[PDB]
Design an enzyme around this catalytic site. Structure first.
Site, PDB file in Angstrom:
ATOM      1  N   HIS A   1      81.129 102.495  70.233  1.00 47.74           N
ATOM      2  CA  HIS A   1      82.486 102.317  70.793  1.00 47.74           C
ATOM      3  C   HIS A   1      82.668 101.090  71.689  1.00 47.74           C
ATOM      4  O   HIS A   1      83.051 101.192  72.841  1.00 47.74           O
ATOM      5  CB  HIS A   1      82.956 103.589  71.515  1.00 47.74           C
ATOM      6  CG  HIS A   1      83.242 104.719  70.585  1.00 47.74           C
ATOM      7  ND1 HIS A   1      82.374 105.774  70.413  1.00 47.74           N
ATOM      8  CD2 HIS A   1      84.281 104.938  69.739  1.00 47.74           C
ATOM      9  CE1 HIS A   1      82.864 106.599  69.502  1.00 47.74           C
ATOM     10  NE2 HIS A   1      84.028 106.120  69.087  1.00 47.74           N
TER      11      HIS A   1
ATOM     12  N   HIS B   1      83.740  97.235  67.486  1.00 48.71           N
ATOM     13  CA  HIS B   1      84.566  98.328  66.938  1.00 48.71           C
ATOM     14  C   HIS B   1      86.081  98.031  67.107  1.00 48.71           C
ATOM     15  O   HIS B   1      86.890  98.209  66.157  1.00 48.71           O
ATOM     16  CB  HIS B   1      84.175  99.639  67.603  1.00 48.71           C
ATOM     17  CG  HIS B   1      85.063 100.804  67.259  1.00 48.71           C
ATOM     18  ND1 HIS B   1      85.114 101.359  65.998  1.00 48.71           N
ATOM     19  CD2 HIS B   1      85.888 101.553  68.032  1.00 48.71           C
ATOM     20  CE1 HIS B   1      85.935 102.402  66.005  1.00 48.71           C
ATOM     21  NE2 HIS B   1      86.427 102.532  67.224  1.00 48.71           N
TER      22      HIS B   1
ATOM     23  N   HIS C   1      92.403 100.569  71.664  1.00 48.78           N
ATOM     24  CA  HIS C   1      92.348 102.026  71.498  1.00 48.78           C
ATOM     25  C   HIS C   1      91.120 102.743  72.083  1.00 48.78           C
ATOM     26  O   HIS C   1      91.161 103.957  72.278  1.00 48.78           O
ATOM     27  CB  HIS C   1      92.573 102.422  70.046  1.00 48.78           C
ATOM     28  CG  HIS C   1      91.327 102.395  69.230  1.00 48.78           C
ATOM     29  ND1 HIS C   1      90.773 101.226  68.764  1.00 48.78           N
ATOM     30  CD2 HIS C   1      90.492 103.384  68.851  1.00 48.78           C
ATOM     31  CE1 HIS C   1      89.657 101.497  68.114  1.00 48.78           C
ATOM     32  NE2 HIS C   1      89.462 102.801  68.148  1.00 48.78           N
ATOM     33  N   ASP C   2      90.032 102.022  72.334  1.00 48.22           N
ATOM     34  CA  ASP C   2      88.825 102.652  72.935  1.00 48.22           C
ATOM     35  C   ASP C   2      88.425 101.978  74.263  1.00 48.22           C
ATOM     36  O   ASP C   2      87.260 102.084  74.696  1.00 48.22           O
ATOM     37  CB  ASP C   2      87.640 102.615  71.966  1.00 48.22           C
ATOM     38  CG  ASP C   2      87.622 103.793  70.992  1.00 48.22           C
ATOM     39  OD1 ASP C   2      88.083 104.912  71.303  1.00 48.22           O
ATOM     40  OD2 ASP C   2      87.067 103.618  69.907  1.00 48.22           O
TER      41      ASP C   2
ATOM     42  N   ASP D   1      90.547 103.688  62.485  1.00 49.55           N
ATOM     43  CA  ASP D   1      89.473 104.098  63.370  1.00 49.55           C
ATOM     44  C   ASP D   1      88.223 104.475  62.591  1.00 49.55           C
ATOM     45  O   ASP D   1      87.109 104.227  63.048  1.00 49.55           O
ATOM     46  CB  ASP D   1      89.937 105.284  64.193  1.00 49.55           C
ATOM     47  CG  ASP D   1      89.134 105.473  65.444  1.00 49.55           C
ATOM     48  OD1 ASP D   1      88.297 104.622  65.823  1.00 49.55           O
ATOM     49  OD2 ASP D   1      89.367 106.481  66.082  1.00 49.55           O
TER      50      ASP D   1
ATOM     51  N   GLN E   1      76.898 113.472  56.742  1.00 47.96           N
ATOM     52  CA  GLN E   1      77.843 112.478  56.215  1.00 47.96           C
ATOM     53  C   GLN E   1      78.720 113.030  55.084  1.00 47.96           C
ATOM     54  O   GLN E   1      79.945 112.860  55.117  1.00 47.96           O
ATOM     55  CB  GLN E   1      77.092 111.189  55.811  1.00 47.96           C
ATOM     56  CG  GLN E   1      76.561 110.391  57.012  1.00 47.96           C
ATOM     57  CD  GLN E   1      77.699 109.845  57.865  1.00 47.96           C
ATOM     58  OE1 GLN E   1      78.554 109.102  57.380  1.00 47.96           O
ATOM     59  NE2 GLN E   1      77.746 110.261  59.126  1.00 47.96           N
TER      60      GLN E   1
HETATM   61  C1  5MF Z   1      84.069 108.870  65.082  1.00 45.80           C
HETATM   62  C2  5MF Z   1      83.723 110.032  64.134  1.00 45.80           C
HETATM   63  C3  5MF Z   1      82.965 109.403  62.978  1.00 45.80           C
HETATM   64  C4  5MF Z   1      83.373 108.279  62.335  1.00 45.80           C
HETATM   65  N1  5MF Z   1      82.726 107.703  61.287  1.00 45.80           N
HETATM   66  C5  5MF Z   1      81.640 108.246  60.800  1.00 45.80           C
HETATM   67  C6  5MF Z   1      80.915 107.615  59.648  1.00 45.80           C
HETATM   68  N2  5MF Z   1      81.132 109.412  61.395  1.00 45.80           N
HETATM   69  N3  5MF Z   1      80.021 110.160  61.083  1.00 45.80           N
HETATM   70  C7  5MF Z   1      80.075 111.157  61.961  1.00 45.80           C
HETATM   71  C8  5MF Z   1      79.092 112.271  62.041  1.00 45.80           C
HETATM   72  C9  5MF Z   1      79.294 113.189  60.788  1.00 45.80           C
HETATM   73  C10 5MF Z   1      78.324 114.305  60.966  1.00 45.80           C
HETATM   74  N4  5MF Z   1      76.985 114.187  61.084  1.00 45.80           N
HETATM   75  C11 5MF Z   1      76.522 115.502  61.248  1.00 45.80           C
HETATM   76  N5  5MF Z   1      75.200 115.810  61.445  1.00 45.80           N
HETATM   77  C12 5MF Z   1      74.162 114.928  60.944  1.00 45.80           C
HETATM   78  C13 5MF Z   1      72.891 115.804  60.949  1.00 45.80           C
HETATM   79  C14 5MF Z   1      73.293 117.207  61.433  1.00 45.80           C
HETATM   80  C15 5MF Z   1      74.811 117.237  61.317  1.00 45.80           C
HETATM   81  N6  5MF Z   1      77.507 116.435  61.234  1.00 45.80           N
HETATM   82  N7  5MF Z   1      78.660 115.649  61.036  1.00 45.80           N
HETATM   83  C16 5MF Z   1      80.008 116.246  60.938  1.00 45.80           C
HETATM   84  N8  5MF Z   1      81.154 111.104  62.822  1.00 45.80           N
HETATM   85  C17 5MF Z   1      81.813 110.007  62.482  1.00 45.80           C
HETATM   86 MG    MG Z   2      88.281 106.704  70.452  1.00 42.33          MG
HETATM   87 ZN    ZN Z   3      87.745 104.053  67.899  1.00 41.41          ZN
END
Ligand code: 5MF
Ligand code: MG
Ligand code: ZN
Length: 312
Positions: free
Chosen positions: A67, A71, A105-106, A216, A268
């Site tokens: 962040h 970004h 935004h961040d 985002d 993912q």
């Molecule tokens: C800002 C939110 C965001 C934006 N862009 C991307 C590519 N991602 N990827 C994530 C994490 C996605 C995820 N990884 C996991 N774990 C990995 C191992 C155990 C569970 N559970 N989950 C839901 N969050 C974001």
């Molecule tokens: Mg944010």
């Molecule tokens: Zn952001």
């Protein structure tokens, strides 16, 4: 007058949704101004004020793994691509406001989620009970706007100024992913029952909210190597938050637990299926020329599938 220009490869590739702004930090301000100039006009902002605004914004992003200032510029570039591919759909104030909103935004993000601030009992969680960081980012935006020589909106009337700050507020609040799910569902329904109406201000607001989520999240719409390396920065933050959760005596969610390193590929998948794909699908429905984002997202989902199958 002085137009900003870019080397040939950048000049061409910046127009594409999957453009990566590159590792040379010192070119990011110029890349942003270039985008303002083409999506808004050389007359939108006084150059000297704009450059000073950009530099203060940069100064107020922190050195965190994800962040951060790169970004901010990345999210603004995705917004530029959306705006340029939907020329006639947006007002002049929207064009002005949205790139600024994206850059801001961040602002002053610390690398921690709203949820961590709430459990830590950070002062910001008392000041702003929901969308904690996002209300903070908007507040930082107003502060910077009010510094001497930083009012890039100086040539707008009281009511136009009020409208642009309102667009910015709403755009920034919309980047709270907790709000995205319900916003996308409403949009889906309105689109399907044909009630969606772009002359309805509260409908535009929702459309802009979804654009914000789409910008985002745009790391999932890049070339695979960019997507994959960004995912490393994302988890670097999350896992540091995980550690901080354990310091408070709380088991973090799996997303934030570095002991779950191996399940990343599967995390993912759920994320592309639950969040990313639905976001770009609904966006493509509402705004057909943004389809390259959905297409790229689907390609990256298929790459994470390959990682799970051991083919990468
Ligand atoms: C800002 C939110 C965001 C934006 N862009 C991307 C590519 N991602 N990827 C994530 C994490 C996605 C995820 N990884 C996991 N774990 C990995 C191992 C155990 C569970 N559970 N989950 C839901 N969050 C974001
Ligand atoms: Mg944010
Ligand atoms: Zn952001």
């Amino acid at each position: 007058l002085m137009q900003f220009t870019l080397p040939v490869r950048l000049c061409k590739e910046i127009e594409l949704f999957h453009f990566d702004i590159g590792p040379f930090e010192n070119m990011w301000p110029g890349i942003f101004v270039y985008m303002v100039h083409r999506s808004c006009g050389t007359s939108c902002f006084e150059l000297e004020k704009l450059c000073r605004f950009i530099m203060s914004v940069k100064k107020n992003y922190r050195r965190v793994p994800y962040h951060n200032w790169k970004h901010a510029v990345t999210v603004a570039h995705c917004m530029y691509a959306i705006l340029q591919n939907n020329h006639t759909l947006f007002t002049d104030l929207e064009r002005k406001g949205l790139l600024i909103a994206c850059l801001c935004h961040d602002l002053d993000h610390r690398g921690f989620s709203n949820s961590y601030l709430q459990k830590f009992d950070h002062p910001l969680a008392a000041l702003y009970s929901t969308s904690t960081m996002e209300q903070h980012h908007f507040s930082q935006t107003v502060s910077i706007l009010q510094l001497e020589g930083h009012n890039i909106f100086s040539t707008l009337s009281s009511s136009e100024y009020e409208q642009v700050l309102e667009i910015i507020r709403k755009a920034i609040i919309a980047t709270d992913l907790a709000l995205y799910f319900g916003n996308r569902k409403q949009l889906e329904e309105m689109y399907q029952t044909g009630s969606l109406n772009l002359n309805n201000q509260s409908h535009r607001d929702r459309v802009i909210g979804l654009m914000m989520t789409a910008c985002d999240l745009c790391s999932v719409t890049k070339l695979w190597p960019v997507t994959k390396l960004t995912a490393n920065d994302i988890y670097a933050e999350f896992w540091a938050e995980g550690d901080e959760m354990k310091k408070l005596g709380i088991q973090p969610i799996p997303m934030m637990d570095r002991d779950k390193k191996d399940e990343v590929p599967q995390g993912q998948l759920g994320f592309y299926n639950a969040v990313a794909i639905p976001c770009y699908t609904t966006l493509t429905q509402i705004l057909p020329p943004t389809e390259p984002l959905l297409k790229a997202c689907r390609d990256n989902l298929s790459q994470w599938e390959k990682v799970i199958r051991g083919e990468e």
